[PDB]
Amino acid sequence: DVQLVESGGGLVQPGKSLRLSCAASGFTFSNFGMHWVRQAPEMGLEWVAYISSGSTTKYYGDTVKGRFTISRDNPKNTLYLQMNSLRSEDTAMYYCARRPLYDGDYGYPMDYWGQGTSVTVSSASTKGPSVFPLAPAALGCLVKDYFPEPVTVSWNSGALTSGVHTFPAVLQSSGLYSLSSVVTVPICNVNHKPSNTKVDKK
Amino acid sequence: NIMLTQSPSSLAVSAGERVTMSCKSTQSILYNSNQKTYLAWYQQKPGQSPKLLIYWASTRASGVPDRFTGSGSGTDFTLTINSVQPEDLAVYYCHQYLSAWTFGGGTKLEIKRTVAAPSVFIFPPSDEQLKSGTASVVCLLNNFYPREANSQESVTEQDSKDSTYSLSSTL
Amino acid sequence: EHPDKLEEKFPQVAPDIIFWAHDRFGGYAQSGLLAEITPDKAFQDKLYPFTWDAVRYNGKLIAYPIAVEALSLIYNKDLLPNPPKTWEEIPALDKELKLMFNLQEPYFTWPLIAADGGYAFKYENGKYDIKDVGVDNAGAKAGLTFLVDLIKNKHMNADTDYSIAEAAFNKGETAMTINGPWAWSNIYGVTVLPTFKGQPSKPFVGVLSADPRIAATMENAQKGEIMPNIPQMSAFWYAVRTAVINAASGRQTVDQALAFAQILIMPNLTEEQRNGFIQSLKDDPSVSKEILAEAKKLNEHQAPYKLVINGKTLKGETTAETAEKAFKQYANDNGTFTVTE
Amino acid sequence: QVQLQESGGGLVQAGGSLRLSCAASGSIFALNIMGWYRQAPGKQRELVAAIHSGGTTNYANSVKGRFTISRDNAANTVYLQMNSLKPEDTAVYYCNVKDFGAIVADRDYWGQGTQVTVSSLEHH
Amino acid sequence: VRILTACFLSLLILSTLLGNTLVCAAVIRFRHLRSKVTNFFVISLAVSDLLVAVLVMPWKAVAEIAGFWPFGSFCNIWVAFDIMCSTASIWNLCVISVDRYWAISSPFRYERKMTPKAAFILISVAWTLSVLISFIPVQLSWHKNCDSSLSRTYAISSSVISFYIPVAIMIVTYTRIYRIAQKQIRRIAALERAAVFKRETKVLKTLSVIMGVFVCCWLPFFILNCILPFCCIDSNTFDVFVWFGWANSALNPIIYAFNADFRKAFSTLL
Ligand SMILES: CCN(CC)C(=O)[C@@H]1C=C2c3cccc4[nH]cc(c34)C[C@H]2N(C)C1
Ligand SMILES: OC[C@H]1O[C@H](O[C@H]2[C@H](O)[C@@H](O)[C@@H](O)O[C@@H]2CO)[C@H](O)[C@@H](O)[C@@H]1O
């Protein structure tokens, strides 16, 4: 089936450039146009840019025109978004979405969306996460001292799903983030891409 | 750049109850060629990308349950769910693709249920945490129906399987 | 047979064989109206190579050349002993007697427009540039403004045509005219076209395809250029024609006529966009240049270090003393460089 | 009083052409400026084009060449031609009449403008 | 008759104060009024006019009522304030005329060049010139009950740099405006005749009501101030002309702050 994946996100400083990439598979990429959209808690969903099938017409948002540049490489079925002069509001989760052929005749809007890449802008430096195992039935793990938001936890390498609770992270007083992952049993693995850390809680 | 507005910001209804959400447009989005109104609705679950439910404001997409119905015209549109299932806990966004693509504010929907009792647990700070100097005890309260139970707390999103919240607090 | 508007009758009809210039055969072959006849080496040897080059298009031979035609200044020796050498002296000689040619067809007046450098579909690197249309340059502007000034100076009629000019020249009324070899059988002396602003006249050479007079004709030809063979010529001609009808009749100024021609030349623009640009040029000539720039812009749019930990409870990887100290601090906060416990 | 009746706005495909017309009824002094502005939802009102009674015209840097404003000889009817329309051109187009009847000041007349929408759909 | 004189003078001061206060309030209360750059100049004028009714007119009125100058050690500062306010008002009128001409002749360039910063700079330049011509010569004894006799050279210089040159500037400005308006009206009339005077008369009447008032109010005062030092004319007529030039301050807003916008503001405010 149609599949879209995104990459290139991470932690960048304000004003720096970033080349977000998107790979599409399962369909004739050269036929369908593409859209880059962004979502953030302060603005919700917000369309960023759009490129046509043949790269003849390109459209950009009102607050991003001139700063961002959308392009595509059809021989390799890839989409690219070069972001420049990144401001403080550009932090968001960016998704790629195809455009059905000739929406004017059939009316089919953007249907397939990718996985999305989270981009955060700030002057602070990256910091690896620290794990603390909280044993008691239920056992948890506290992930603290990590500034970047992108982070995931998997209990027993994903062997079970029932009874797992990954609490949303919150802004710590020291400017960092902290979360908790607890399992109610009748060891885990924490991955952090922005800092490239794969840690074992226990 | 047509702007859209969603009157219901956040509401909670019981399982199986008929719910409806309205959407207001700043101008007409009717196409004179095919005489079709160009408006669509997307569903984004917690931790997932948006999912197209209805397009053209009248035609339901493929694989979408029949409980979702779209109606309206001009600048007033309506999305109705005759029987909201626990799996339907998600955010509904209105979107238009006739003019410049824009998205609305979103309608957060929650599921109301019985008052479930919370399960309480406590965990002192581990030795590895005390080594750095932190002695923040961790309190946990699983299976809250209500969202309310140097301290900071975090609540899990209402799961679409049991419809119960879970809270944690630390020093 | 010779039906009127043959160049315009043939497209809608498609005669077994058509005798017309090669400039129109381009558009005919673009759609497949002319049959690709196979020539013979013996037949190519008996003809000149420049004729084959003129009739060549896309690297294939379409039809057989017949003869080469070029415009020349035909004057009556009974009226003046020597012909004028420069256009600037015609307004004087004329007013000393009291030039007349076909003012309807643009092919007869194009030499004056191109004399000062006017061109269309510039020939660069051996190929025509369809995007580079220089009909609005300073040379064409000067040529057309001089033409309309001469028309307004009571020197040439605004409704004259080939028939009227020929009838006036045969009766000895006009002193000189501009005509090619086809007018000799109906009709004196002939010479090169007069220069304009020091520059020579550039008449188009029309090679038909399926002596002092010849000397003057070949001189006018080598002073000019061979007509292109791209399909965009026919329409272009029509555009120029309108400009002429917009210049001699005084319906609008020179800038407006040239802008109309430029807009009509662009084939990619639809009818609605063409009419919109025409109205924009009509109601506001102050920014006509920017309007033409935007029209061109739209023409190209519709064109078809690392750390590894192996402790008893914490194991994995994460991301020289400057970095080793930071790695040690991170490990301490956790309770290729590798550390184990 | 001065009345401004605007018309010509509506739905149009991208790249097409549109001719808006505003009729001004009432006594208007000779020295006066007639212009078209655009206001988008959420954004502010910006200048699109303007024309003086002397024939001089003025356009913005984003609509120079694409848009063209003009006025009638005696009917005081303002025409605005728009070609190569873009999706970002959808807005409410207002007609501003700046009259200099009082030399010490100027009076601005508006006609509530009209909506204009530019589509972005594909066909064939 | 002295009682009647007092009544009249007080009525004039109260009317000036009320006009200036109403103008200032209507300007600072609404936002669409302050959006226009030219209006800034008016504010300055109003401010100046207000001062004329606060620190200048009441003192002279009470002095003429009492018949002498009771305010000891106050004549110098009072004359300084009077000269400053007069020069400020004259330069405000001049710059207002210049701004109107620049907006009428070339509005496309006026809307881009004339900015609030430029208006503030012009107002500050005018105020600094007024201060330099009023306070510096009086405080340094260069201008020499109380009558404040005046030297010839200083009086001539002040009258030339504060009345004659601004008057000529305003005259040429209004002449250019009238010529442009006449050209436009003639063009419109020719167009109407080809399609098959009241407007010029209206323009002339407007320009008259605008200029001739200030002319007849401030010409004889300066004429006497320039003729008296050379010598004569009596002080009663000089005081009458000074009072006329001061009433011109109250008449200013009726001419420069009485358009449709100001009328609507006054209607919706009260
Ligand atoms: C009879 C005596 N008084 C009053 C004390 C004057 O002469 C005042 C002096 C003035 C005066 C002097 C010199 C320069 C000027 N600019 C503007 C004025 C001005 C105003 C003008 N006021 C009206 C009268
Ligand atoms: O309308 C202008 C016309 O010019 C040409 O035809 C010339 C040709 O050079 C001669 O063979 C002779 O017939 O005089 C003609 C003038 O009409 C072009 O060949 C033609 O395309 C164009 O319409």
Side-chain angles (χ1 to χ4, degrees), chain A residues 1-200 202, chain B residues 1-126 128-129 131-133 135-171, chain C residues 1-170 172-304 307-309 311 313 315-316 319-341, chain D residues 2-4 6-24 26-124, chain E residues 1 3-28 30-116 118-270:
Chain A
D1 54 356
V2 175
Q3 190 191 37
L4 305 170
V5 303
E6 290 92 329
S7 57
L11 178 60
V12 301
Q13 284 75 359
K16 298 293 185 179
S17 297
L18 187 64
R19 188 173 186 80
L20 300 172
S21 305
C22 166
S25 315
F27 65 102
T28 46
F29 173 81
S30 294
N31 294 12
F32 305 81
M34 281 294 161
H35 299 247
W36 274 104
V37 179
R38 72 183 183 181
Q39 179 182 19
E42 60 256 10
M43 71 194 71
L45 274 161
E46 182 177 63
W47 164 76
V48 183
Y50 152 73
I51 185 167
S52 51
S53 60
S55 306
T56 71
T57 171
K58 304 178 184 179
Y59 297 139
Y60 301 95
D62 292 87
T63 79
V64 301
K65 204 166 214 313
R67 302 195 298 109
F68 299 173
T69 297
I70 190 171
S71 61
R72 65 193 295 163
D73 303 348
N74 291 337
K76 49 179 66 165
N77 296 25
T78 312
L79 185 76
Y80 291 97
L81 184 73
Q82 190 76 19
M83 317 169 74
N84 312 121
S85 184
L86 287 169
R87 299 205 304 272
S88 198
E89 301 84 76
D90 294 327
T91 173
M93 182 74 79
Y94 289 75
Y95 304 95
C96 177
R98 72 170 204 167
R99 192 186 181 183
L101 290 172
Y102 319 133
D103 56 0
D105 291 321
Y106 309 109
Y108 270 104
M110 59 187 77
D111 49 4
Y112 280 99
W113 295 58
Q115 63 180 10
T117 47
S118 183
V119 173
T120 170
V121 284
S122 57
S123 315
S125 315
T126 185
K127 190 181 180 73
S130 185
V131 305
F132 300 120
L134 312 167
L139 61 152
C141 315
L142 194 69
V143 182
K144 271 166 68 67
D145 293 358
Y146 67 100
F147 171 76
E149 183 49 289
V151 65
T152 176
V153 175
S154 159
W155 272 95
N156 293 327
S157 61
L160 73 174
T161 301
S162 279
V164 307
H165 301 78
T166 312
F167 295 82
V170 288
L171 293 96
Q172 200 165 275
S173 45
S174 45
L176 309 174
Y177 288 81
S178 55
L179 58 78
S180 306
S181 180
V182 186
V183 70
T184 54
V185 290
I187 188 166
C188 65
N189 186 84
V190 57
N191 301 9
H192 190 285
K193 285 302 311 187
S195 161
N196 183 237
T197 81
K198 275 86 79 177
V199 199
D200 210 326
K202 177 152 56 53
Chain B
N1 45 74
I2 301 172
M3 300 296 180
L4 315 175
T5 300
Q6 301 189 236
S7 36
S9 315
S10 173
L11 81 178
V13 300
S14 315
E17 185 178 359
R18 180 170 186 277
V19 76
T20 187
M21 54 195 71
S22 87
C23 164
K24 181 63 171 58
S25 301
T26 49
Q27 66 189 239
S28 279
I29 55 183
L30 180 62
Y31 207 54
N32 302 330
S33 181
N34 54 30
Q35 204 72 12
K36 298 290 185 178
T37 173
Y38 275 63
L39 183 126
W41 291 87
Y42 294 88
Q43 187 185 33
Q44 192 187 14
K45 287 166 175 175
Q48 296 186 3
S49 53
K51 177 183 173 183
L52 177 61
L53 294 183
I54 293 165
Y55 67 95
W56 262 345
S58 192
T59 75
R60 187 185 300 94
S62 75
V64 176
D66 190 68
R67 54 174 175 275
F68 303 93
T69 68
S71 57
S73 297
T75 71
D76 284 85
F77 300 81
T78 300
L79 172 58
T80 298
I81 313 175
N82 281 39
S83 74
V84 55
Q85 297 292 346
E87 59 172 48
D88 296 329
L89 206 164
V91 195
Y92 298 92
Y93 296 92
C94 64
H95 164 255
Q96 60 90 9
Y97 44 108
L98 173 60
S99 177
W101 302 270
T102 63
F103 287 79
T107 297
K108 186 176 180 62
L109 187 138
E110 298 182 301
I111 303 298
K112 293 174 67 174
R113 58 155 292 167
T114 67
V115 180
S119 171
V120 194
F121 282 95
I122 187 154
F123 309 92
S126 63
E128 311 306 335
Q129 187 186 160
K131 183 67 68 168
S132 279
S136 68
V137 292
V138 177
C139 188
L140 172 136
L141 307 95
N142 267 339
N143 299 130
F144 263 112
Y145 158 61
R147 73 187 84 265
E148 203 285 296
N150 61 326
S151 159
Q152 60 179 12
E153 81 305 341
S154 315
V155 290
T156 69
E157 190 52 13
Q158 199 170 8
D159 58 87
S160 306
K161 57 203 291 212
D162 203 38
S163 309
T164 47
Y165 300 77
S166 159
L167 187 141
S168 86
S169 58
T170 71
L171 301 180
Chain C
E1 53 189 341
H2 41 66
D4 213 318
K5 311 299 183 292
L6 195 149
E7 78 293 15
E8 300 187 347
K9 298 287 188 180
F10 186 81
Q12 64 180 12
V13 165
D16 45 358
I17 313 184
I18 170 160
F19 278 19
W20 195 258
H22 70 273
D23 74 85
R24 291 276 176 167
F25 290 178
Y28 301 165
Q30 183 270 332
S31 66
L33 313 183
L34 301 154
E36 201 69 9
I37 184 160
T38 43
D40 315 327
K41 264 294 308 177
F43 268 54
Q44 294 178 27
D45 203 338
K46 63 180 70 160
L47 277 162
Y48 308 98
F50 77 100
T51 58
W52 290 116
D53 186 349
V55 82
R56 190 190 309 278
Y57 168 76
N58 264 27
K60 58 184 181 181
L61 271 44
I62 299 177
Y64 297 92
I66 317 303
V68 185
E69 292 192 6
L71 291 172
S72 307
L73 186 73
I74 308 180
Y75 58 98
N76 192 339
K77 291 286 287 189
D78 313 328
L79 272 292
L80 77 178
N82 58 335
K85 287 185 282 293
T86 306
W87 278 87
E88 279 74 326
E89 291 107 40
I90 294 178
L93 176 61
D94 273 327
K95 73 172 183 62
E96 283 175 298
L97 266 67
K98 215 176 286 177
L99 175 60
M100 185 180 295
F101 57 92
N102 188 342
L103 263 291
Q104 304 300 104
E105 280 292 309
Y107 171 68
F108 294 84
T109 184
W110 181 256
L112 170 57
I113 307 180
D116 197 8
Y119 65 90
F121 312 111
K122 191 180 184 65
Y123 197 67
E124 57 173 61
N125 285 27
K127 65 163 286 196
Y128 309 96
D129 186 328
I130 312 187
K131 298 179 177 62
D132 195 311
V133 176
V135 302
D136 281 25
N137 64 337
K141 191 89 81 179
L144 192 52
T145 200
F146 181 82
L147 180 74
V148 60
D149 290 327
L150 262 57
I151 292 279
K152 199 187 80 66
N153 287 15
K154 197 209 76 174
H155 284 44
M156 293 185 286
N157 304 326
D159 186 38
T160 185
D161 51 18
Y162 173 69
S163 87
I164 291 169
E166 191 160 60
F169 189 68
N170 298 132
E173 313 189 19
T174 69
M176 51 190 160
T177 185
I178 293 162
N179 252 310
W182 66 86
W184 301 336
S185 181
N186 178 292
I187 292 160
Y188 73 101
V190 306
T191 184
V192 296
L193 294 159
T195 62
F196 176 69
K197 290 176 71 177
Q199 301 221 67
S201 295
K202 310 188 76 171
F204 266 131
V205 175
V207 177
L208 259 59
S209 299
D211 310 85
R213 309 187 298 192
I214 299 295
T217 305
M218 295 297 168
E219 201 164 35
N220 286 289
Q222 68 90 27
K223 281 202 177 189
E225 57 263 27
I226 292 162
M227 278 196 281
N229 214 317
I230 60 178
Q232 290 78 4
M233 284 297 300
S234 52
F236 145 78
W237 278 108
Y238 158 76
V240 177
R241 189 190 294 274
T242 64
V244 179
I245 305 308
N246 296 340
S249 279
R251 302 176 185 178
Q252 50 195 146
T253 70
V254 188
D255 312 328
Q256 303 301 78
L258 292 189
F260 277 40
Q262 261 285 4
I263 290 297
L264 291 165
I265 282 166
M266 300 182 182
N268 297 333
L269 302 184
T270 50
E271 209 70 2
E272 49 169 344
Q273 301 174 350
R274 187 172 293 96
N275 296 332
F277 281 122
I278 282 169
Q279 187 62 57
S280 288
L281 296 162
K282 282 181 173 295
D283 54 18
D284 189 8
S286 306
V287 306
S288 84
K289 185 254 181 174
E290 285 74 3
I291 299 168
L292 294 172
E294 293 294 344
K296 183 179 185 178
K297 186 183 288 184
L298 189 65
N299 173 24
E300 291 168 299
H301 182 63
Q302 301 182 176
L307 170 65
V308 172
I309 46 154
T313 43
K315 56 167 293 312
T319 300
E321 181 62 4
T322 62
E324 212 64 11
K325 63 203 301 180
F327 283 129
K328 179 176 171 65
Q329 196 72 357
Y330 288 7
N332 182 70
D333 311 328
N334 293 7
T336 79
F337 316 99
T338 171
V339 176
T340 174
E341 211 69 40
Chain D
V2 188
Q3 301 294 340
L4 307 179
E6 283 157 306
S7 87
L11 188 66
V12 60
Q13 192 69 359
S17 286
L18 190 64
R19 190 165 189 77
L20 315 181
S21 181
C22 172
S27 180
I28 302 171
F29 188 62
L31 284 162
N32 63 90
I33 307 168
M34 322 201 75
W36 280 84
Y37 296 62
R38 68 183 173 186
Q39 186 173 2
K43 297 169 61 55
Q44 66 186 31
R45 188 175 298 174
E46 57 186 7
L47 169 63
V48 172
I51 171 160
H52 198 213
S53 301
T56 66
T57 60
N58 181 24
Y59 302 95
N61 309 135
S62 58
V63 300
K64 183 176 287 301
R66 304 191 302 96
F67 294 178
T68 294
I69 192 174
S70 55
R71 64 186 304 169
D72 207 332
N73 304 130
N76 276 343
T77 302
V78 193
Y79 308 99
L80 182 68
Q81 190 73 16
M82 300 181 298
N83 313 279
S84 60
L85 284 164
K86 301 179 179 181
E88 55 263 18
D89 296 330
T90 171
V92 190
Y93 281 79
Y94 302 85
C95 170
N96 168 261
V97 178
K98 183 178 288 302
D99 184 4
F100 299 102
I103 310 188
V104 294
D106 50 66
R107 191 164 180 182
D108 284 311
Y109 314 98
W110 303 85
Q112 305 179 5
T114 177
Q115 183 65 235
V116 174
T117 300
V118 179
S119 300
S120 301
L121 306 170
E122 297 179 330
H123 303 91
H124 309 288
Chain E
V1 63
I3 61 171
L4 315 168
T5 314
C7 183
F8 252 80
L9 296 183
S10 82
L11 177 63
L12 179 62
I13 292 164
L14 260 292
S15 87
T16 320
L17 267 163
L18 62 31
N20 307 137
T21 50
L22 285 170
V23 168
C24 287
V27 164
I28 68 190
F30 310 112
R31 182 175 292 276
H32 68 285
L33 253 70
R34 281 180 282 92
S35 66
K36 304 178 180 180
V37 176
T38 182
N39 277 334
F40 299 143
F41 301 100
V42 180
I43 301 176
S44 46
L45 180 65
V47 171
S48 174
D49 268 350
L50 192 75
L51 270 57
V52 175
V54 169
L55 306 174
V56 189
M57 290 171 73
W59 310 123
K60 183 62 171 178
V62 73
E64 279 167 326
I65 289 160
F68 54 94
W69 187 252
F71 310 100
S73 315
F74 199 75
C75 183
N76 296 326
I77 184 60
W78 176 88
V79 170
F81 280 139
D82 172 289
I83 298 163
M84 179 183 71
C85 292
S86 293
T87 305
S89 180
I90 294 168
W91 273 109
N92 271 280
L93 290 172
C94 191
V95 69
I96 284 168
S97 88
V98 167
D99 189 83
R100 295 310 313 167
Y101 154 74
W102 196 8
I104 289 170
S105 71
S106 180
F108 300 147
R109 296 294 194 278
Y110 167 86
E111 293 172 21
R112 304 194 307 97
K113 294 291 183 185
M114 177 55 65
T115 50
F120 296 150
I121 286 169
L122 291 171
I123 291 163
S124 51
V125 162
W127 274 109
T128 54
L129 179 58
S130 174
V131 165
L132 261 56
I133 187 52
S134 174
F135 270 81
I136 304 303
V138 173
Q139 293 279 331
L140 296 175
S141 185
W142 291 357
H143 75 113
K144 291 298 300 189
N145 36 67
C146 172
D147 292 278
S148 182
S149 64
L150 177 63
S151 90
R152 296 179 291 93
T153 186
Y154 163 77
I156 290 295
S157 57
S158 178
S159 294
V160 171
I161 70 188
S162 95
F163 182 75
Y164 288 140
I165 295 157
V167 153
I169 289 169
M170 290 177 64
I171 283 171
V172 299
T173 310
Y174 292 138
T175 307
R176 290 180 176 277
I177 291 171
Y178 181 78
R179 292 296 181 193
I180 293 169
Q182 186 180 29
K183 186 186 291 184
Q184 291 292 341
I185 290 163
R186 289 285 177 81
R187 188 185 66 82
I188 294 297
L191 259 58
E192 205 288 314
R193 191 68 174 178
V196 190
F197 313 99
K198 60 188 288 182
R199 312 185 221 197
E200 279 157 294
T201 300
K202 284 174 175 294
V203 172
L204 182 62
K205 189 259 183 176
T206 303
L207 282 165
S208 159
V209 172
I210 286 165
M211 186 58 178
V213 171
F214 156 78
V215 170
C216 94
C217 281
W218 278 99
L219 190 132
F221 155 68
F222 274 94
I223 288 295
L224 292 184
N225 186 23
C226 297
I227 289 170
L228 177 62
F230 283 82
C231 279
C232 295
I233 190 64
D234 209 271
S235 185
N236 301 125
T237 62
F238 201 54
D239 284 326
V240 170
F241 286 127
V242 164
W243 274 114
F244 266 100
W246 287 346
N248 175 83
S249 295
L251 261 57
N252 274 19
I254 303 303
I255 308 306
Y256 288 85
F258 211 67
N259 54 78
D261 302 70
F262 277 80
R263 286 177 181 178
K264 183 181 67 54
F266 300 148
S267 294
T268 191
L269 181 61
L270 275 294

